[model samples]
Target: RNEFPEDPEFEAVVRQAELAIERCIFPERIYQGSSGSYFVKDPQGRIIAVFKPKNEEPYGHLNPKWTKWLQKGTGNIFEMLRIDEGLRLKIYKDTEGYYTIGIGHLLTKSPSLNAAKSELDKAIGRNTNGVITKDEAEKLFNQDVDAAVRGILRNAKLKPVYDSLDAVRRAALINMVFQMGETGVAGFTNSLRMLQQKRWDEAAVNLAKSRWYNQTPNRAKRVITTFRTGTWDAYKNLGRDCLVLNQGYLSEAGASLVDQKLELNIVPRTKVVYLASETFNYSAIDRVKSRGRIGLPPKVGSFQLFVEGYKDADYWLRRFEAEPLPENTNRQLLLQFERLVVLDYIIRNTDRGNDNWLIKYDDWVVVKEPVIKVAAIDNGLAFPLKHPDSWRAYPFYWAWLPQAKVPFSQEIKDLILPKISDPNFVKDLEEDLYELFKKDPGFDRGQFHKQIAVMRGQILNLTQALKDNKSPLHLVQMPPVIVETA
Candidate 1:
């Protein structure tokens, strides 16, 4: 809801980050694997790793939760979390099916938030050529598997600090927290460096603390970043720790849902959805005749996409045998959904996909119809994938007209294309997003700039800094693109 930051060109941090990512810098490295990213072994040899060495665990706080995501490629959920806190928790797909768990922010800020955000911005705010010339995404489709490698690692790197972060990053930080934790990022020695080194804590005390048993460089750096950023809480400070959780086990189910709501801010009682469809190919979408809608599900008089989950299925069983509904995928709904993706691409939240669409049903119709709100869901893929160098040396989408990026594709434009009519809706969404970031107790375009100023910044800072410096943040060194389940 941050008023689109008055972006004349509407160029955002993600696009800038995209520019940086194309440089192929060291560390936040992404590469295509021939056989199978060493261990995973992609059948098509499309294995990838985000800025880490080959044949090992992935690097950084890559969200393994999204390892199974099919729509957008796997970039670190770190960037994806910016859009949906749940993505940090929900970034997942697997043999069972794609699902996301929300990150459990202890409802506060962690000491290393600055470093985490700053470090995160560098990676998540980049642009690499997407699957198509126009469709902007962090790492196009399956490439996520590679980003997943780093995200899982990076996730752990940023986890332990949420107990102290303000609400905004708490949402964004959830992704980092989950991924880093899973990849042993916190346990990684790298996160430890973020700890106050001057203190007397050593191997013995750390080992006895239980965390040391599985610690690694990634986690060490995360902790050290927390301490150095100086956001550490009183209790965590004494612990020589990294992050600060409010003190409780996380309920991954509802974690990311908070941010998604804020961003989507359904017009109260509106039946907006956060779809979780598993779209593998066009053929699979034949039955996908429905999508989500914006406002409340129709008043049962009219309908769009039908909304049904386990409960809906159960309801049908009690009263009637559900017949196989035709695959009459509402082209309008799907088109609208696609347009929404384009809009999100411009905004820098590119993590949502088929499974993340919003949906509902109306009972007034004979068949009990479904009304759909073509809205955005999990944006785990919006952050920049390339850093230290993601911009195109030449001009591209936003470069030509600046405002050109505002509209959606021709086919899906009806659903998402804000009309002269919905100026208020458009303005409100912009205002809301702006407030979400601006009014935030921890909001700091300057700090974000400082973090990314090394690479990128808020809309204002980033633009000016780039105009003046003509260069982006330098890339930091990272380890291999691998994971250790422990």
Candidate 2:
């Protein structure tokens, strides 16, 4: 019985089982032999006893000496067939027509011997119809999948790089490795190295100019595109559906181009591009039934580089207030600050705050004795069509600073006067802004015209304020519009 102990007689039998377990034996495993008999072993490989299914050991009628004859090394090797899960002892012919068991263990190379084992399986009543159970089959299939995943991780040898990728990109790459076997992917060693180094477009090109790409045109294009863009899917709607009239990304890019056109490198370069990511906010159901080559489909928008060492104006301003800047540095810094004011005025960037613009000082020495440099960032909230009474009438924040008391500089005025007066320059700046904004499906040319009118109006007042050397408070008092009658 499977039960351990009941009375002294049964406990004595357990004691005998324990006595057989010491230096005498150890269990490798307990298994049923082909004879349908249960076995018990010792610390040694030698068997202590074997019993029929309904019958167990030490019966008085049995000869005890016959049990000792069931020694080690006389039994079939069960462990040989136990390497991986969900496998059976069924015999099949290998590639060379050898009768094999558990993948490659040959029972005999003879077909007659193989047929006999198949017949043996029939008598054993396992795989009786020569078919594995559904449970066994499924388990084996899962094992093969696991083996493939492990193989790719080993062969790719990009553990950190693989881990660094987002879920969608990781899924895409793992899927790629699955499609191309370990040996096949290893051939693109150079491309994989580029991926490790984060040389995205270069890595993509490396993969693209390969035979793999030529062989699978559609798949390669999507895979290569993902690598180049660092996104999962490579396709989506341009700009039709958006909650906030789709201004966020496009505004930043347009602002950068305008800054560049005005010969002011205050804003970094920006471009309209496509990128897809599941990390983006979307409905749960959309993610579950996600479309495209990979994760969320690519949505078109602007990408801008916010490059500068400016920690923040708020932090810098507070620091400066404590120790103060050098003699000419405050004036010099204010001149740079005025350029930002000028830029924001033209764009009607209603959200100019100390946090949005960044600040940094040249570390010629420690904190007190270095030139301060400032740059505008977070210009995404700019270029609105009109001021709103309820919420959108946010003014420039920097005007509250002590620097706002300083008179407009002649040097700055001389630089900006000719450019603002030039009709072509204004038109070109508008055209560039339009190029970015039009990509959004919500882009209204009528609203955009109002935006331009507001910009030209700012240009008109700022030109006057600079010429007259008006204080910032007076500058704010200027009419909100130059062309439109209130």
Candidate 3:
């Protein structure tokens, strides 16, 4: 379980990285095996990402989605505080794959693994879900530790930080145990006393003590006031449909729930964790399923898009000039609308937004450093069973097409290759796209020229779905449009 031998080589790399961690921005990427390594961190530092790859073949094929997502000016490049919730820490399915473990969170001034283990022990009065009675806390804490130790011993190959763990190793095993047992929380707080003198570690431990963990600040429901909204019903309903079409009597001010701050806010990133953890099973996943490619049987744009405009209409109109319009929005009439949407759908089951998004050269943000290529972090949303909402279309890909020399870029062509799909369909789509693109020389300049026969068909299908029997927006009987970006 404990992968001691796999180190030595990597340990040197880690040690060297550690020495320059604080001084050298984004330390994690260098130690790992990424082709483009820079500005990343492991557990103890502040930036980039840490994806430790395997040395062998077959299993070692890291996906390019992650590479593209990690770069600057992209999707959901989250704040440092929220990065943990968006991060992907899945293990390579077989013995030969690799993983990206964000070690910085564990090393933060508070809420570190050590602190949680302690508080969890004292809160439990019984051995439910592997906890301890306050009276026998210390004894219960030590009880099954060796089993965890043994598991680590048995599976050393799986441990992400086994080599340089000593620098922050003491809490390694214990943190993992608490994560699994849920009992190991509380005073175990990361007692470093940072973050404006508040005991964050203590707070994390207390959170772990809640009813979910079974040890609350007080047993009374009245005393436990935070993050509890009747909106659970709305969340469930919208999640099932994979769309958020209605706000019901909701005004612009009521557009989001955060302004109300439900009791769930007490727990760190509760709202995000609620939606993500349940859906994005990060531990052990394999080969994601996504839409075949931009060119389907009929020839189309298979992607997802979300158009956002800032500083009012003028600002938005100008910005739209740059980005791909969101899928299904009224903007599709614009050029490249179909291809943009296509890219959006194909890669969307793409887990590349929110936490997976990346940006570069921004001074206002902390750990301020530039990053490249939006690397793929999680594949949970990919095809086969991609969440209905995750599917979208890219808009810009075709916006400039009409005027440009080449409308169908090589990127789109690569997408339809057999590699994008199985052997049979791949063969069909490739030949079809080749002929279509070449035949339509005036596609961009002409009004909805030859490039569109397939795109128009697909949009018709999506539009029909929204118009018939379905109320994706749920509350409004307005236009067929789902959401408006810019």
Model 3 score (lDDT): 0.26
lDDT of 2 by residue, 1-486 (tens): 212232344334334434554343432222432221223343444444322211111111111223332221212112111221225445566545655443223344567863746754643456434344445444444453554457667854645556666544454465455445556666677877777777887887888788776866555676676567654223221111211233656666667777776665677555444433332333445577675334554444443443546687898889989999887887768877777777787777767888887787873655564477777876666776665343324666777788877777787788777788787888788787777677666578777777777777888887788788886657776767645533
TM-score of each model, in listed order: 0.25, 0.46, 0.22
Better of 1 and 2 by lDDT: 2
Q: What is residue 147's positional error in candidate 2, in angstroms?
A: 61
Tell how far residue 174 is off in model 1, in angstroms: 27
What residue runs in model 1 are displaced by over 4 Å at the alpha carbon?
1-223, 229-329, 358-432, 447-486
Model 2 regions lying over 4 Å from their true place: 1-244, 283-295, 363-370, 390-393, 482-486
lDDT of 2 at 371: 77
Best by lDDT: 2
> Model 2's lDDT to the true fold?
0.56
Candidate 1 achieves a global lDDT of: 0.28
Task: Report the lDDT tens digits of candidate 3 across residue range 105-190.
Answer: 12112333334333333334432332223334333333434444444445433233223233222232333442333224222233
Ranking by TM-score: 2, 1, 3
Cα-based lDDT at residue 435, candidate 3: 40
The reply for model 3, stretches above 4 Å from the true place, is 1-139, 147-333, 352-381, 384-486
For model 1 the local lDDT of residue 154 reads 54
lDDT of 2 at 230: 50
Worst 10 residues of 1 by lDDT: 296-305
TM-score of 3: 0.22
